[PDB]
Design an enzyme around this catalytic site. Structure first.
Site, PDB file in Angstrom:
ATOM      1  N   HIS A  41       0.805  -1.215   0.000  1.00 52.79           N
ATOM      2  CA  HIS A  41       0.000   0.000   0.000  1.00 52.79           C
ATOM      3  C   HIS A  41       0.843   1.271   0.000  1.00 52.79           C
ATOM      4  O   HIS A  41       0.298   2.357   0.227  1.00 52.79           O
ATOM      5  CB  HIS A  41      -0.966   0.005   1.189  1.00 52.79           C
ATOM      6  CG  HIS A  41      -0.299   0.151   2.521  1.00 52.79           C
ATOM      7  ND1 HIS A  41       0.153  -0.928   3.250  1.00 52.79           N
ATOM      8  CD2 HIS A  41      -0.019   1.250   3.261  1.00 52.79           C
ATOM      9  CE1 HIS A  41       0.686  -0.500   4.380  1.00 52.79           C
ATOM     10  NE2 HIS A  41       0.596   0.817   4.411  1.00 52.79           N
ATOM     11  N   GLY A 143       4.009   5.727   9.983  1.00 51.83           N
ATOM     12  CA  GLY A 143       5.325   5.620   9.388  1.00 51.83           C
ATOM     13  C   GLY A 143       6.073   4.363   9.769  1.00 51.83           C
ATOM     14  O   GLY A 143       7.145   4.103   9.205  1.00 51.83           O
ATOM     15  N   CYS A 145       5.070   1.366   9.165  1.00 54.85           N
ATOM     16  CA  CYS A 145       4.767   0.292   8.229  1.00 54.85           C
ATOM     17  C   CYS A 145       6.032  -0.139   7.499  1.00 54.85           C
ATOM     18  O   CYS A 145       6.819   0.695   7.046  1.00 54.85           O
ATOM     19  CB  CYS A 145       3.704   0.747   7.232  1.00 54.85           C
ATOM     20  SG  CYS A 145       2.051   0.897   7.941  1.00 54.85           S
TER      21      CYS A 145
HETATM   22  C1  LIG Z   1       1.573   2.596   7.983  1.00 48.17           C
HETATM   23  O1  LIG Z   1       2.718   3.146   8.573  1.00 48.17           O
HETATM   24  C2  LIG Z   1       1.224   3.376   6.715  1.00 48.17           C
HETATM   25  O2  LIG Z   1       1.784   2.742   5.597  1.00 48.17           O
HETATM   26  C3  LIG Z   1       0.400   2.670   8.960  1.00 48.17           C
HETATM   27  C4  LIG Z   1       0.862   2.215  10.345  1.00 48.17           C
HETATM   28  C5  LIG Z   1      -0.396   2.211  11.421  1.00 48.17           C
HETATM   29  C6  LIG Z   1      -1.003   3.262  11.406  1.00 48.17           C
HETATM   30  C7  LIG Z   1      -0.415   4.229  12.692  1.00 48.17           C
HETATM   31  N1  LIG Z   1       0.067   3.457  13.588  1.00 48.17           N
HETATM   32  C8  LIG Z   1       0.167   2.053  12.933  1.00 48.17           C
HETATM   33  O3  LIG Z   1       0.566   1.061  13.439  1.00 48.17           O
HETATM   34  N2  LIG Z   1      -0.664   1.816   8.460  1.00 48.17           N
HETATM   35  C9  LIG Z   1      -1.987   2.368   8.214  1.00 48.17           C
HETATM   36  O4  LIG Z   1      -2.199   3.513   8.424  1.00 48.17           O
HETATM   37  C10 LIG Z   1      -3.099   1.469   7.673  1.00 48.17           C
HETATM   38  C11 LIG Z   1      -3.201   1.705   6.167  1.00 48.17           C
HETATM   39  C12 LIG Z   1      -3.074   0.419   5.344  1.00 48.17           C
HETATM   40  C13 LIG Z   1      -4.203   0.371   4.317  1.00 48.17           C
HETATM   41  C14 LIG Z   1      -3.135  -0.835   6.214  1.00 48.17           C
HETATM   42  N3  LIG Z   1      -4.380   1.800   8.273  1.00 48.17           N
HETATM   43  C15 LIG Z   1      -4.633   1.651   9.695  1.00 48.17           C
HETATM   44  O5  LIG Z   1      -3.785   1.257  10.422  1.00 48.17           O
HETATM   45  C16 LIG Z   1      -6.004   2.015  10.257  1.00 48.17           C
HETATM   46  C17 LIG Z   1      -7.048   2.596   9.544  1.00 48.17           C
HETATM   47  C18 LIG Z   1      -8.101   2.760  10.399  1.00 48.17           C
HETATM   48  C19 LIG Z   1      -9.544   3.358  10.182  1.00 48.17           C
HETATM   49  O6  LIG Z   1      -9.912   3.838   8.919  1.00 48.17           O
HETATM   50  C20 LIG Z   1     -11.234   4.288   8.826  1.00 48.17           C
HETATM   51  C21 LIG Z   1     -10.516   3.411  11.333  1.00 48.17           C
HETATM   52  C22 LIG Z   1     -10.109   2.898  12.668  1.00 48.17           C
HETATM   53  C23 LIG Z   1      -8.727   2.329  12.858  1.00 48.17           C
HETATM   54  C24 LIG Z   1      -7.720   2.279  11.647  1.00 48.17           C
HETATM   55  N4  LIG Z   1      -6.427   1.820  11.549  1.00 48.17           N
END
Ligand SMILES: *[C@@](O)(CO)[C@H](C[C@@H]1CCNC1=O)NC(=O)[C@H](CC(C)C)NC(=O)c1cc2c(OC)cccc2[nH]1
Ligand SMILES: *[C@@](O)(CO)[C@H](C[C@@H]1CCNC1=O)NC(=O)[C@H](CC(C)C)NC(=O)c1cc2c(OC)cccc2[nH]1
Lengths: 305, 305
Positions: A41, A143, A145
């Site tokens: 992603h 960040g 990820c």
């Molecule tokens: C990555 O760093 C981005 O590439 C990010 C890491 C998490 C988010 C912040 N802290 C972490 O561990 N990953 C994301 O942001 C992911 C995106 C991809 C598609 C998996 N999304 C989430 O973690 C997320 C989205 C939502 C949401 O919507 C609507 C509603 C509630 C919780 C939630 N978590």
């Protein structure tokens, strides 16, 4: 003596942490040999995250779209492929710091070390366990990820986790290094819940052996129980059933302390029915289930890496 | 989100760990540039450690009496000297993995990351806190002397601890990288007992700030005290008095939450006098004291290195 939550030395992983940028999205990559692994992603826009068609979006990208950073050296992408939720960016240069590595899929209850990273730089290392509902109680910020989970055997690093998202309950979910998610989760910006989380029983039993090895015996009792009668009470308190394999794994811990595994089960049975009455075990007011029997043996027995 | 004990990335310290052998005794050594640092009791046999005369023992030792190994490769000793309780061995080769480093003496309450080593091979990494009685609640096994504790500031690695011994009580003691012991302990095979431990008051306040940064703020008192009045009441509960670097170090956390340090001090005194009444803060209801205010800033912000 002593007993701390110990993670593996992260040096072998830090030499592979790179930065992957595509468009306006930046996350972490794992640079092994001439391939760089990262969550797929990174190719998504803010509007793409809601409902992404990944093979669709990936076909609309090219090698020069991906900005790969290793230190202050831009790595040139010479090819890209996709394996599940993991992107594979082939580059022109190989990583000299590539260790002996392997891709494994850990079973729930096992433990691994997480190297939290942001923009390709290591921030911290800590130890996690794959909970029975395929989530981890990690520590992650936007960040992170691309951060990977790992174990080291001899000189071989066995990668098993890549971070992908954070659940609304504060826990985290991700994939193995093949791209397959742990649990019923998907890489979209949605609110996703997990199944009910049970307690890893054999991990609690090893933790109690660790407390006895370290001079804490206030929880032991002069009773014993059958394996089934323990699983009956343990199931009542949302604990995973103890198998004959689990009892066999606790063998060395039972031998060192002279306390039978079925004796420790009677203690855990008492602890679940009566509580800790305000006392601590290894400095914890709760029953800890994030240490495997190997984690206790590798610390208490004296094994070294 | 997610809050847990987080150790520094141990890669930069890993490339400085070596093996030091004198006769039959082996421990660990720190190899920076062309000097290897290790505990001076490596020149001791079993019966020498009972009542050792370290200046008299060093006079009967030569450069060729020292075996310094990086893995299995031997580094010839071209010079030896002694500073307090550490041994300095000049080596014929300068370490190409030497990072920008510092030798610092930390205060009781400050945290560092220990890279447990055995025979010059790093075994694990975990975060520790220096107890007010100058011990650490570590996790060490035979052969762990020479394992170092460290903190990382940007690209600089600060060495602040070298492991030496384990007290009968199960905790551990050691020196800085200048050879001076932390506490009233001496490097000998003697039963040594530390003073009465207290609670790191600055660290529980940072932990209360960490809870306020997240969801939990139920303990806000809307009261205040003087720095003198809180220090007098805190000592009545086996809590450390607040010094000046304590109040100033809690600054950024106080500005982030808008809750004054002395206001947070009165909230904590309310928790010491009346307890928590079956309420929980940040999960565990145990008033954690092993997180420094930097540990909160570093974890909650995502500071990399
Ligand atoms: C990555 O760093 C981005 O590439 C990010 C890491 C998490 C988010 C912040 N802290 C972490 O561990 N990953 C994301 O942001 C992911 C995106 C991809 C598609 C998996 N999304 C989430 O973690 C997320 C989205 C939502 C949401 O919507 C609507 C509603 C509630 C919780 C939630 N978590
Ligand atoms: C080092 O490996 C020695 O190189 C060793 C590490 C400790 C022992 C195992 N776990 C540890 O943390 N250090 C020692 O053995 C030191 C040696 C001193 C500095 C000369 N001794 C102790 O740690 C020690 C001695 C005694 C004792 O006496 C006898 C009585 C009770 C406890 C105790 N600990």
């Amino acid at each position: 003596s002593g007993f701390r939550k110990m993670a593996f030395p992260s040096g072998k992983v830090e030499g592979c942490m790179v930065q992957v940028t595509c468009g306006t999205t930046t996350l972490n990559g794992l640079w092994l040999d001439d391939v760089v692994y990262c969550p797929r992603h990174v190719i998504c826009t803010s509007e793409d995250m809601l409902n992404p068609n990944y093979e669709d979006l990936l076909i609309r990208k090219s090698n020069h779209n991906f900005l790969v950073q290793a230190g202050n050296v831009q790595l040139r992408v010479i090819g890209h492929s996709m394996q599940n939720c993991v992107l594979k960016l082939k580059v022109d240069t190989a990583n000299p710091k590539t260790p002996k590595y392997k891709f494994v899929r850990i079973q729930p209850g096992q433990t691994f070390s997480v190297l939290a990273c942001y923009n390709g730089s290591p921030s911290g290392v800590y130890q996690c366990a794959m909970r029975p509902n395929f989530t981890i109680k990690g520590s992650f910020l936007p960040g992170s990820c691309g951060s990977v989970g790992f174990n080291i055997d001899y000189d071989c690093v066995s990668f098993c986790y890549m971070h992908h998202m954070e659940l609304p309950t504060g826990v985290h979910a991700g994939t193995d290094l093949e791209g397959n998610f742990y649990g019923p989760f998907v890489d979209r910006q949605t609110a996703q819940a997990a199944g009910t989380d049970t307690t890893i029983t054999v991990n609690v039993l090893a933790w109690l052996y660790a407390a006895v090895i370290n001079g804490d015996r206030w929880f032991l009792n002069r009773f014993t129980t059958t394996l089934n009668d323990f699983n009956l009470v343990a199931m009542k308190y949302n604990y995973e059933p103890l198998t004959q394999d689990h009892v066999d794994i606790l063998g060395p811990l039972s031998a060192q302390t002279g306390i039978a595994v079925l004796d420790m089960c009677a203690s855990l049975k008492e602890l679940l029915q009566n509580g800790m009455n305000g006392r601590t075990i290894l400095g914890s007011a709760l029953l800890e289930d994030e240490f495997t029997p190997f984690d206790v043996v590798r610390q208490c027995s004296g094994v070294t890496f």
